[PDB]
Amino acid sequence: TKWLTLEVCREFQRGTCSRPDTECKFAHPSKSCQVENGRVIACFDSLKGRCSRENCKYLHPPPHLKTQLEINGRNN
Ligand SMILES: [Zn+2]
Numbered sequence: 001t002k003w004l005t006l007e008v009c010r011e012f013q014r015g016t017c018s019r020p021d022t023e024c025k026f027a028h029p030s031k032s033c034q035v036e037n038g039r040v041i042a043c044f045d046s047l048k049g050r051c052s053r054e055n056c057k058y059l060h061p062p063p064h065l066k067t068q069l070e071i072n073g074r075n076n
């Protein structure tokens, strides 16, 4: 679903964002992530902390982006 999609950090994605993952407002994909230009898809199962993949294809977000996905997934 589109539930899970996040705007990627245009700076990170070109090697130049100097913000902790946990203080930047956009996603920083572990370099194995499926990024559809601008958008990564968040890990449904990681949210419930229930992911178990070593190298994931769907981003495991930091806290703030996780609650921002909880908010987004309360909006029917
Ligand atoms: Zn950034």
Ligand SMILES: [Zn+2]
Pocket: 043, 045, 046, 051, 052, 053, 056, 057, 058, 059, 060
């Ligand atoms: Zn995962």
